[model samples]
Each structure stands twice: as structure tokens, then as C-alpha cells.
Target: GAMAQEEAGRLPQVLARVGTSHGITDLACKLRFYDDWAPEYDQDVAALKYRAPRLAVDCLSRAFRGSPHDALILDVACGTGLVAVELQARGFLQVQGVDGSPEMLKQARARGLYHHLSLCTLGQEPLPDPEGTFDAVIIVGALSEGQVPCSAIPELLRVTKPGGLVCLTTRTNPSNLPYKETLEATLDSLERAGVWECLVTQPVDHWELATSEQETGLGTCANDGFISGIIYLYRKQETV
Candidate 1:
């Protein structure tokens, strides 16, 4: 009976789990949930066909006029080092990652991709790095409604070197649209403040497969299609 129960617990529940994650509102509760979710995170995101990591990396790779081999990259909201793997594949040699969950960082550390990994709750904690420490900062799948707030954008810029690239992504589905608006607003405001200049703002038609009915809506049973998302790439000004 014990063996059977343990086996049953391993059954794939990717979509259902992803759906439940969308409803978490409290920060501490969300962190605990992510800790529990870390074991299956990479597989679950793969099951959902998550694309932000690839897209954000592609955007950075294209816009980054630097040597990837020499670049010191920071992966914020790194989440099991998905982006780090992608960055490593693109020749980024010195990648570092930070996340809020201990288990998540454990999973990231196991990948052997990052030069360093630290625990950090986005929107609440300062990143464990000095100013202008990295040549590029990439954050994916963490700028949405229930994750990090728009106010944290500057923190991304803060740790980035002058003239470094800062890449970000957020979902454009109805459930996340409002958050996307404020995110873009903050990006624009920062640009206006002469902090960073936008390089690319591309809207990806199929960012990922929808994991919840809230995103797909109950009116449509055929909600298996992918949802939209957007990516923003900016360059920090030569002077702060």
C-alpha cells in the first residue's frame, strides 16, 4: 500500500498544478508552493511547452552586441536554471542564477550550468550582487501577475553593467494582460528617465500552451491552442 501510494504521487499533473499556481496570492505561500513544485518544475514546464526561456535567450543573443564567451550573465527568477541551460548553449560561459526557493536553487545547482546560485525572493529581496556586476540580465516567466512586480525592473537594471542588456518577458493572455500593461508602462517610464533604452519589443504569437481554464476561459472547451506573450530587450544607458 505504501509503495502504491508513492507511485501514484508521481503521476503527471502538470496542467492542474500550473493552474493552481496561478491562483496563489501570498508571497510566503507562493515560495513554499514553488519549493514543493521544484522537483517536477522542469518537466512540468516542458509539458506546458514553456517558451520564454528560449525566446528571451534568442532576443538577447540577437541584440547583445557582446562576446557571449566573455559576458557575465545573470539569470533572475532563474527557476531551476532553464534559462541558464539555454544561455550555456549560446556560448555564455559565466552565467549566474538566483531564485526564491531553496529547492529551486537546489535543482538549478544540480544542472552545473551556473557559476553561482543564490536564494532570492523577487520583488521583496535585493539580489545578492553588486551594482553593474553583469553584462546581461535575463528574467523569464517571472514578470506576470502573481510573480514579481513591475517595480523590480530597475533592480534588473541595477545589477547590469552600463550599456548592458536587460531582457524580460511576460504573458499577454487575458489573465495576465493587466500586469503586462503595468510592466510595459514601467519599462517606458524607465526609458523616459534615461535609465535604459528599449531595443526590441516583440510580440510572440505562441509563447506557450495555456495551462489553465482561467486563461482559456470556460466558454471554450477547445482551449488547447497556445497563448501569446511579449519580450522586451533594453540596453542600460552609459551613465546612470
Candidate 2:
């Protein structure tokens, strides 16, 4: 217990450092951020009580009735393989990942969960595949502020085979309304364009909570830190 207590507290520092910045600019800066957090990315989020991974998997696991052993699932913004790990816990086997950070990818590769892991920046790369290649494409906690933009939804849909599912998530908090609105509109546009159809839309509670004491490092204090998120599940339309 003493050793554990003494070894703790790294997350607050990392969180504060990341919180100081607002919005990403160049790819170099983006790589640096994830590279620095790659080592403790999982453990650190535990301190803040982050639950997007499990919550996302729970929603997908229940809604997706496809065969995990056979269907290929792509995890975008796979961050330290947390989502893959959650999916693995629920008996998923054929999982692949893509992220811009090689350092972060290194850690994910070590997990031996992903069938294939590639390096590609979302909104910049074409998923390193032709099109309609995956059975399901999932990206958790990547649609909000300072992360993957709203422009990548079409690509996500394009990569998914017709009748396949794509699950996305984003912060539903007030502070994120602008981007959320854009994302919401983008999704609606795609649906109207005959690209895909919405399957499920749900709000996840306790998605992430920031504390008053460590306002920057974390969030949620019954004041201004508490935040929730939304889960969007859609199915690509079958087109001949």
C-alpha cells in the first residue's frame, strides 16, 4: 500500500500539462502528446475514473450481434489499446487498430490483441485501405474537442462494409456544443445522402468526471467539472 501510494500522482501532472494546451496544430505536436502519455495512458485515466472504454464496449457489445471471431473490427484512435482490451474482455478476437502516434501504437502492439495496427492520422489519411473493408469501425472518445475532427465520419462510413456498423462517441457537455453540433450535422448529412442510417444514439453518464480539487488535471465537482458524452451507432447502407 505504501509503495502504491508513493508511486501514484503522475496522472495529475500529465493531465495538467495536457489541459494547458487547447487544440492541436501540427502532426508533430499530436505525436508528442500521445507519445508522452503512452506509458501511463491507461493507469493515469484510472485515477480520474475515465469510463469511456468500458461504456463504449458495453454499448457496442450489446448492440452488435456480429461474430467477433470472424468479423473484422477496426479501432480508430485506439489509444493504448484500451478499447481493444475492453472488446477482448467481451470475447472479440479480430480487432485491428489505427492511430497517428507510433509511440502509442507501440504500446498497443505490445498488447497482442490487434490483428493489425497501422499508423494513420484521422482526417488526414484514408485508413490505409481501399474502401468498405471492415465489418465494424469503432472510435471512442475521439470526436470531441482537440481530438479527431467531425470531417472523418464519412471516411469511417466509407471503410465500413454495407450493412456493417460504425460506432462513434463524443463529449455531450455544454462546452463542446459547437463541435458537437458540427458532428451532429455531419452525421445527419451523411444519413440523408444515403450513406448510412442511425441505429442507436445514447447518452452515457459518468463518462468522465473532473474534480474541483484537481480542476485541470481532472473534472466533475457538482459544479463545472461534470461532463457526459454521447454514443452514436449507425449502419452503412447497402448500395449496389
Candidate 3:
């Protein structure tokens, strides 16, 4: 107990222990891991040079173009409200957050940024919002391998109002290639089905610290390399 808690506070230890996941296939351990890491997640992520929150927020901000600050925006898997903080700094209002961990939401609530925050495991729970509820929906770092499934795309599109933006990010490394390939195929399928239009996809090397040293990993370590993430911005088709 003492060692794990003590080790949890150190960034390097956290990275070495938690960063190397190829993909966590176990649901119990996944929940327990985040539960334990929730207290120190933000600091640990910072030590690893996490960048998705800021990058995703900035990209969404530019594409948002015309919506008022009060426009409803949904932050999916909104761990610790990092993106919420960024969005508010950019003048976004009415932000709502959802994450799988209650402890994570506990941390997020302390920031007092979200108008709404709830707990739900992605891919298991459909987004709790009604159809056409949000003006925009953004998820950062949750669309990767071992995390949420590629099948959640349609539900994300369904919750947004017509012509609203949906943004997501995932690693493009070798480990995640299969997942990314499937993600692309799903996106392309959605596009052809007239569900949404792909607008911008940006590859960012500094997206976060590679959790592992794999060529397919993410983080900022020169030796271990960093997780490079691609931001996918899409627009829901206007109802015909």
C-alpha cells in the first residue's frame, strides 16, 4: 500500500508502470488502474508532457468559428476536465463532461469548469445526452487502442445538432495501427453513408508523452519517443 501510493506520486514511476500498456483488455483492472491513478493523474500526465487537451481544444476552437460562448459542447471521456479548462479559457461556455471514473470526475468537479459531469464507461454507455443536444462534441485521447471502440462514432454524431462538429484523437503508432486503420475505415464508412464530413485531420508529434518506449507509443521522452496523435474533426451532415 505504502509503496504503490508513494510510487504513484512520482512521474517516472507512473510512466514506467502505466505507460507501457499495449492495451488494457481487462475491465476490472482498467477501472482499478484509473481509480488509483486518479489522484495523481494530472501531475503524472504533465510529467509525461501530455498535450492532447490543449491541441484538441485549439483545433476545436478554430473550427467552431461561429458558435457563441454559450453553445452547448460535450466533452467525452472528459478525464479531469483538462479540455474543459482549455475550452473555458477560449471563451467556451456550457461545457458538460463525462468520464468512466467517479474519482476522475471528482477531480474534474474541483475545477468548477463543467456545467455537467457524470460517469460512464465509453462504448458501454451510450452518451447520456439526447439526440441533437450538443452544438459540438470533442473527445481527446479516448479513441485509441484498448480504449473506446470504433463503433461509438454514430452515437457521437447522433448527439450533436445538425452541422455540429465532432472531434476525436488517437495515436498513429505501430501498436495502434490496427485500431487506427479500423477507425479510418469506420470514419470513411460514416462519410459515405452521409453521416458526417471529414474536415481536418492534423498529426501532432507532441500530442503527449509516450506511455511506453514502443515505436507505436506516445509521450515526450526522446528515448521512449512520444505518442503522436492525429486530430480528426468532422461535421454532422445537415438533415435533408
Candidate 4:
């Protein structure tokens, strides 16, 4: 009896194969890669990948304008604390960093930029509370296919205080258009889920050390491999 209401199912072997191909099982391996490459992160960013973080910081600066003192900032997926260091240099005193890679956190700790560091994944774990803790949350160059997924945006919005800012950057490429669409859709979903309020969107040519020329070149070819990034600002709405 084949009813239209009958449910379909995938074999365990097929599911396992798909998951492996997607690298979900390689989470530890990915963290290890960051750990092994932590020392070289800054050098790599300086060489070409710097634009995303730079743009992220620029958005954070504009969002937090006129604060009396250093504002509390949380850097999610704060690899090597590059953005934390930049924010501290820009007068942000209470900076915290979180990442899944302990090795990367170790490197960031060595720099002494962050007031605190936590080893956690964006959507996988519950965020620690300091109670109305952070004024802003920044995610730079860390939201993508193998890293943080769009599904985690709600969790990110959850930890942010009311009227606090949420800033994020994603590399733009042709391949990333779908991912971008997913992110935008997720934002809407989060809003519908009673999370955050959308603020503004700014398109930047380059971020830190990456140049417009390189980004333009990359955008012409692959869809998600270049320095083309977008900065999105959102404010957590006060809960009723």
C-alpha cells in the first residue's frame, strides 16, 4: 500500500556518506587546522584576507559612536583575536573573544588583547552570561560553509543585549550568492522568531589588507572565494 501520506526515508549509509562529504565529521580536524595555523593567521590576513575584519571593525566603530569609555564587545569566532586587537587599539577596553579552537584561543591569549576568552561554537553550546553583558557582538570572516552556518544567527542574536549591536561580514562571490541568500533569509527568520531588529547594510570594496582589485577579480570568477564582503548591522530589540 503506497499512500501519498507515507513518509520517505534515507538509508543510514546514504546519510553517513553525505555527512562525511560535507565535512561535518571533520570538526575536530578543522579546529586542529586553525590551531596549527594560528600563528600564521595574522600574516595571512595581512597578505590578502584582511578586508573582512577591517570592514567589520569599521561597522562596529560607527555603531558604537560617542560611548563614554571602552564599550563591551564580544567577538564570535574571534580567530587569533585580530579584530579584538584592532578594537582595543581603537579604545574598546572590555573585549571578549570566543572560538571553538583552543589553539587559536591560545594564540589570541598570547596577544593579551581580550579581557576574556571562551572556547565554544556559535550554535552548539549555550553562551555564558554576564547579565546584560555585551554592548555588541562581531563576527568577521568566520561565517560560511565549513565554519559557522546561517542557522547560528538566532543564537548570536540571543546573547546580544537589547539595543546592542550585531555586526557580521561574509565574503561575496558567485558561489556565495546562495549562501548570502540563506543568510538574508535567516535574518528574516530570526526577526520572525522574535530575536533582533535589522539596522543597515553597507557594501565595502575591501576590508583590511585585501584590495578592491583582487576582490573584483575574484568576484568575476568564483562566487565565494574573494575579498568581497558585506557588513550587516542589527540591534537586539528589547524583550517585552
Candidate 5:
């Protein structure tokens, strides 16, 4: 079962009040954002976006070149299945996507790119299975305030097969720019758990700005502050 109470324990009571006051369930808010954004998502990314999905895919493909032939890839918090679609477009079979938002999952399924789709909130529940079913897992833009918490990293590492890869990206805010610190903490926790091996950590240049037409009442730019994204890759090691 999802530990909402324990997880919520860390969150400020005021924040929880605001969430409840607005009739906004965390999961529902996520779904609404994706549902509203789904129509323009492809176009939004096409013309103006932070990081290119292809770049992430390129890195993953290179890392898994010599791995098993039938590799399974899980995309966590895969909104609209963009990454999965990109992998499929690049001819990578056996891709699956999991998200907590049903609307987002619906958009993902509409693309017909993923092999399977499930509605599971990472960190909240044990993974769908524990057979080491996936050879690779990729998560992007899902770790942060509203999405999966940092505590879920260990569970992700648990489900990945030995010698397999885990690739993820996170955006930088003014408060958390140069996210190496936060990422390191997660890696350290995973290492302490004896679950995964850190392979590479690097910073890449990626930025996005909204167009004039896309601007709403507040402003055209969707993300106003300093925005940077980082990619972290880890390799799962075989058990003794």
C-alpha cells in the first residue's frame, strides 16, 4: 500500500490544506495537467521544450548496446508516453510506461507505442512485479514536488536487473540547481541499500521557453525561473 500518511508527514500541514482546499488530489492534479496538455504536448515539445527526448534515448541506446537482445524498458511517470514513443520510433521494442494519472495513461495508450501501461505511483506502492522483469528503466520529469518522491529511487533500483541500466532526468530550480547534491543523496541511499552501482553523473545543456502565442495571462513562458535538467545513469549489479 502507498504510505501517504508517512510521506505526508514530511510535508507541511499548510501545503496539505491548500491541496485539499482546492479540491486537488495530487493524482488528480497530475491527470488534469496531462489531460489539458496532451493535445498540445507534441507540438509544444516540437517547437519549444527544455530537453530533447531523443538525447535521452540516444544515451540509453548507447548504454544498452551489448545487453540482452530482448530488453524491457520501463518509463516511469511517462506523461503522454513521449519517451516511449521516441524509443519505438527508433525501433526499440518491449517498452512499458507507468504513471499515476489515468488521463496521462490514456494519452500514452492512444499513441500505441508502449507494450504495456499501468497506473502505479512509484514510492507509494511496491512495483507491479519483482521478477527483475525489466532490463532497463527510464524516468524523466517525474521527480519533484508533485510527482514521485526521492524515496522511490531504491524501489526502482530493486526492480532493475543486474547489469541493466536506470536512466533519469530532473530539472533544476533556483533552490535546487546543480541537482548533483540531491542526486548524490539518492545514489548514496541506493548504494547503502546494496541495490545499485552508480555509473555516470553528468550535466547537459537543455532549456525551454514558451512562445508568444502560448503565453497566458501571467506570461508566455511556462517555466519562469532558472530551469536546468540533469541526467543520471546507474547500472544494476548482480547479487552475490
Candidate 6:
């Protein structure tokens, strides 16, 4: 244990500090960290080889029956527009971005892909958009430990047009297992309540580099220093 701890101390400073926000409990402080991370958010995740954005879009594209080029999609907690960028390449032209942090929204704005970028602290307040505003909604990299709460799931359903899709992503590593359970429970409860139907829940074995200390190799370099995650796709029912 001592040797592993010592080895982790030698990790690049950015990698070492990358997961600290997950441990931050205060809302204001967490938003501040996001704002501060805005400048290098893209580069940092790039270094980690983050694959959720691309995978999310892939999952959505496969399940979507309608013409994605004409669909109005919403990217929730869209940090730096990575998801939007992927959607753009896939011919999703009228995408909108929303996030809690103003600085992160600015980074997304620079990409020039989204039709609109708005600031909305999900789970704390209602999304600024009205109900049934989007044809499909996706929230990636924001539905994990210490991030968006399960209560926000309904809000995602609220914004999507009936019969539209709502895609979500979350880590499935040991540290995130508890949150993952609850997240799925919420998804299930909502389904049981006749709100939406689950279409897909795909497991991604190599989601990203293991940045958290617990997931990072302690002694056995399991998964070769990478973590696993999941992608969930659901379709809202025609009636509320």
C-alpha cells in the first residue's frame, strides 16, 4: 500500500488532481472548479483519452430512427462541446448546449456548432428551456459520482419531446458502483412509472484512464490503468 501510494504521488499533477472535483461536496466550490478547469478541460480529458462523448453519440445515432440531421438535440452539461463536435461530424446540425458553469459554456461557444448555449445548474434549478423543447437530449460525463443527482433524470425527460431519446453516461468502476446502482434504479423506477422505455444500456470496458486513486492501480494494474463505464438510452413515452 505504501509503495502504491508513493507511486501515485509521482503521477502528473493534472492527472492527480483531475478527480478532486468528485470529492468536492459544496455546489459553489464545485462550479468554481469547473470554471477554473474550463481553459484546459478539453486538453486534460484528451490526455486521459476520454471516449464517452464519441461513444454517447454513437449510441444515440444507432438508436435514433428519425433523421438526426433535422433533429433538435440538446447536450446537457456539455463541457467544451466535445459531444456537440461528435454530433456535428455525424450530421446533427441543430444541437444546443447547456451547462452550469459560465466559463465552460464559453469554451463550448468557441466551437460554433451549437445553435444556443445556456447556463443552467441542473438539479439545483429547472432547466431554462421549456418542456418538449428538444427532439433528443444527451448528458455525458455529468451523471457520475458527486456530479448530477438522480433526481435530475425527470428534468431530462421533461425537456425532450414525447417519443424522443434521452441518453446518459456514467462510470461503472468500483468507486462508482453505488452511484451507478442508484442511477439505474432511478431509470428503472421511471420506466415502471411509464415515463420512458429503456432502449439500451451498453458497457464500455475502456472508458478512460484511471485517474482516481482507488481505480488507478494499487498493486495489480487491472484494466491496464483504465476504467469502465456505461451508456444508457431511453425513449420518452408519448404521454406524460
**Model 3 Cα lDDT, one tens digit per residue, 78-123:** 4446666677787776767576665566556677767787655545
Q: What is the per-residue lDDT of model 2 for residues 201-226, given as tens digits with 9 covering 90 to 100?
A: 76555344422444464223244454
Superior candidate under TM-score, 4 versus 5: 5
The per-residue C-alpha lDDT of model 1 at residue 60 equals 83
Name the lDDT of candidate 1.
Answer: 0.63
Off by over 4 Å in 3: 1-33, 39-50, 173-182, 206-228, 238-240
Off by over 4 Å in 4: 1-31, 37-50, 65-70, 122-131, 172-179, 192-194, 205-228, 238-240
TM-score of each: 0.68, 0.67, 0.68, 0.64, 0.65, 0.68
Of 1 and 2, the candidate ranking higher by lDDT:
1
Candidate 4 lDDT, 54-149, residue by residue in tens: 666676677666341456777765444566667667667776757666666765677787678775554323344354577777776555434454
Q: lDDT of all predictions, in order shown?
A: 0.63, 0.61, 0.62, 0.58, 0.59, 0.63
lDDT of 6 by residue, 1-240 (tens): 233233222112222343354544554454687568566755655554445567667878888887677888877665446666677787787877577665566556777777888654544334557788888887765543345544565677788887788887654553644455575677677777878878877656434444444655563555444354556788887432
lDDT of 5 by residue, 77-156 (tens): 54446666677776567766576556667656777766787765544444554647788887776554444555565567
RMSD of each: 9.9, 10.2, 9.5, 9.1, 8.1, 9.2
Report clash pairs, candidate 2. Answer: 209-219, 210-218, 210-219, 210-220, 211-219, 220-225, 220-226
Give per-candidate clash totals.
0, 7, 11, 7, 1, 0
For residues 31-104, write the lDDT of model 1, one tens digit per residue: 67656756675565455444556766887888888977788888765444656666778878887757766555
Better of 1 and 5 by TM-score: 1
List runs of model 1 lying over 4 Å from the truth: 1-33, 39-49, 173-183, 205-228, 238-240
Summing lDDT over every window of 10 consecutive residues in candidate 4, give the lowest-scoring window: 4-13
Model 5 error, position 2 (Å): 17
Off by over 4 Å in 6: 1-33, 38-50, 173-183, 206-228, 238-240
In model 2, state the lDDT of residue 144.
32
lDDT of 2 at 212: 44
